[PDB]
Design a protein around this ligand. Structure first.
Ligand SMILES: C[As](C)(=O)[O-]
Ligand SMILES: C[As](C)(=O)[O-]
Ligand SMILES: [Mn+2]
Ligand SMILES: [Mn+2]
Ligand SMILES: [Mn+2]
Ligand SMILES: [Mn+2]
Lengths: 482, 477
């Protein structure tokens, strides 16, 4: 069948990927006791937008649930699926013929049917008539809460939907649960997004020079990803933190826009991932700006490398993800003590939640069409009310087919360190005479993307990771993964 | 005073630019007899957004009116101006301690006062209290219709605004009219955006090779603009049309995403412009993919070069922009007749609106903070209901300080050509046997950015334009 492709060496993605997702969704719904015969899933695609009240178009990127189900790149569509038969119908906007003045040939319905390999294509304004003719029992629409953003996903609506029976509770948890488990076709795309983004990270490590602005590397990364990878979007705004900015976790946004000059002796923490056909990648490389780790930089870096590799080596089906977070915490504390920053009993440090002072974020998160992918906290899965752990984006147990980031880090964040030093339950573990040397260090994060498999994991990311590999890459060189 | 700067060779933009805009706005409002003493302009800045219901942040770019007045890059702000005194107050979000962990330094109010050179800084949650203590007669908020998008600009709101007298009609036409006329400080930024984007267009022309995808040049353009110019944003989605796609005016968007392979013999029409600190550029270069114009390509291209330079040579204060559009139409028709595509009386071709078959869009538009800048159709200025002219984004007369694109083009658009051939009043001019050779040619657009001066214009753009210059540029090592 047909494939999405941006030519050159970019990945051909079969539209069969999306057909398989529709089939899987129907198979799940058919087993659901709340679902009756004759139901139709109704999804609404994203619409074209402009900046504020201007006529400046914003580049359209499809809504993620719609993309998962249909793979459609055009704005203004709807899509329905007959649950009992699996039959799919795509609804596309009716453009008047005069639009050919500005748009060139206006594609036929048949063009879109062939392009997307759906069973039928209709115009959007006909959706009430078309659904009416099917005499559905119920329309299943999408409404639920994203557990990272807190936002409510808005259900499809069209003129005349009030004439139907509509259910907006059944679908969301079910399509989310399908999305949590990636098909082999989806894994091919995620292998690709990791390949390109890994190459781009290596080009950035080769190119970085003392005296450059952080954004010069943002630009270079995105240029590699688009020109060589066909990745028109990034999966999230690039975080290019140098020096003390490497301790700011979501650095790079409009308020702190990658605008610092990189200085000799700085650490860099570059968290960047290109997006291909609305599939994510999410990779963090940490390295010395000048290509040579100092002793202190090597020690912090290798502490995070140790936790990264320990977690990757322990991950397998049945593992409780919060236990991996606690494992990383224990390793960071052990290694910070081995560096002389901390002293005393590590068991006691853990009891005092000291790990969260140095890693205030979750160990990692589901990844897929969204960088923070859906499904981390389905009904019944609770957030753990402790520092660090409460920021985990899932408390699930691992199962084959899940895609996770593994992103431990250690950071020197002044207000968290000062809180600890003010707290008698924590202050005694800290050695100010050594810690003072790490004030303003920034931080290190080592972030890999992995697939849970029957036997463990599959590592998707392919970047230099040991001190020796990184120094070689920065000197321009050719490295072995976990 | 302070300046915005992204280091390296990027432009230092004095924050005095925005202070001058505030002053100019107050000066215009003070002259409006409907404006009450004690009025306060209240603007609301843009807020951070995410993709749909995801927690995927969208990179924040400031709302254009707010930017014009304040130059503020942070989301979640408000800004007010006392009309009678000119005094400015910026309202910034009061951030929680955790912002220090995830987003960065929690800057003090004094930091922002110094950064933006405003008279006072307060927190957003204090705006009702602060405005109350000033005892304004009326709050002037911003509501009006953009004449390109048709969208209604949404006025500021805050908790407690219902307790004030609010007017939402006076401000919009007044701030728009100020934006129409660029200050010398604004012109320095538009010279810079044109400089970087012109350099980037030159690099793209040197880099194009048969066999590349269109989007490889989009990528290169934006990388040049960001890494060398500090332009994190483009002014609009890059249009990288090759072959017949150069006839598709609305090309490059998500439905037609610069994904065609450039072939030997194609024309390229690349319309790209970086944005610096929310100031636009808007440039189109047209050229043969393989670096050498064929005879037909030279003829079409030189026709558009002729109208481009005739229009620029005629532009000066008092000139009616629709007359310039008609000038370009007439020249295109003349050249298309010289080429043998047309025959007969050009006067009669003009009477039959034949020019619009080949150039269906407007000759050019105001440019500033937005690529299609505000103020093209203020009250009393009407849209002309004729082909071509109805797509003009302004029907105003030119005055010093206006910034315009000059962007004539000729395209071979099947829908329009077929229509013209069906109409006996137009078909008699069209030589079907010659036109057939140009089906699938695509099109040519030559787009310059210019400033109206007291005596004529200043050209901002600097790219190769003659056939000889373009071929030389593309052959450069
Ligand atoms: C800062 As992230 C995209 O690894 O959650
Ligand atoms: C296609 As345009 C931004 O020049 O109007
Ligand atoms: Mn990341
Ligand atoms: Mn991540
Ligand atoms: Mn343009
Ligand atoms: Mn333009």
């Amino acid at each position: 069948g047909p494939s999405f492709w941006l030519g050159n060496e970019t990945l051909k993605v079969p539209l069969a990927l999306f057909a398989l997702n529709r089939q899987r969704l129907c198979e799940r719904l058919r087993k659901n006791p709340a679902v009756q015969a004759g139901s139709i899933v109704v999804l609404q695609g994203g619409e074209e937008t402009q900046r504020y009240c201007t006529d400046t178009g914003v580049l359209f990127r499809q809504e993620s649930f719609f993309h998962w189900a249909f793979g459609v790149t055009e704005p203004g569509c709807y899509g329905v699926i007959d649950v009992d038969t699996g039959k799919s119908t795509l609804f596309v906007p009716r453009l008047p013929a005069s639009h050919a003045t500005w748009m060139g040939k206006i594609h036929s319905k048949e063009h879109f049917k062939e392009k997307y390999a759906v069973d039928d294509v209709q115009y959007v304004d006909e959706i009430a008539s078309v659904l009416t003719s099917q005499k559905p029992s119920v329309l299943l629409t999408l409404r639920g809460v994203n557990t990272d953003s807190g936002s409510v996903c808005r259900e499809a609506s069209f003129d005349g939907i009030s004439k139907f029976e509509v259910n907006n509770t059944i679908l969301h948890p079910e399509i989310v649960e399908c999305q949590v488990f990636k098909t082999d076709m989806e894994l091919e795309v995620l292998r690709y997004t990791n390949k390109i983004s890994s190459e781009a990270h290596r080009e950035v490590m080769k190119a970085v020079k003392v005296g450059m602005k952080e954004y010069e590397l943002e630009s270079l990364f995105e240029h590699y990803c688009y020109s060589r990878g066909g990745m028109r979007h990034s999966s999230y705004t690039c975080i290019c933190g140098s020096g003390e900015n490497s301790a700011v976790l979501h650095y790079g946004h409009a308020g702190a826009p990658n605008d610092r000059t990189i200085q000799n002796g700085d650490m860099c923490l570059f968290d960047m991932g290109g997006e291909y056909y609305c599939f994510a990648s999410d990779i963090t490389c940490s390295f010395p700006a000048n290509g040579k780790f100092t002793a202190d930089q090597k020690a912090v870096y290798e502490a995070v490398l140790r936790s990264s590799r320990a977690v990757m080596g322990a991950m397998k089906p049945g593992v409780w993800w919060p236990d991996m977070h606690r494992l990383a915490d224990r390793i960071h504390l052990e290694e910070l003590a081995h560096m002389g920053i901390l002293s005393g009993s590590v068991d006691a440090m853990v009891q005092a939640h000291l790990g969260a002072v140095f890693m205030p974020h979750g160990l990692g998160h589901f990844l897929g069409i969204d960088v923070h992918d859906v499904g981390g906290y389905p009904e019944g899965v609770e957030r753990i009310d402790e520092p660090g752990l409460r920021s985990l984006r899932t408390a699930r147990h691992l199962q084959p087919g899940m895609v996770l980031t593994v992103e431990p880090g250690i950071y020197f964040i002044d207000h968290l360190l000062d809180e600890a030093l003010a707290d008698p339950a924590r202050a005694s573990f800290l050695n100010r005479e050594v810690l003072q040397r790490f004030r303003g260090f920034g931080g290190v994060r080592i972030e890999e993307d992995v697939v849970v498999t029957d036997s463990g994991i599959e590592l998707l990311t392919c970047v230099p990771r040991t001190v020796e590999e990184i120094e070689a890459c920065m000197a321009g060189c050719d490295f072995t993964p976990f």
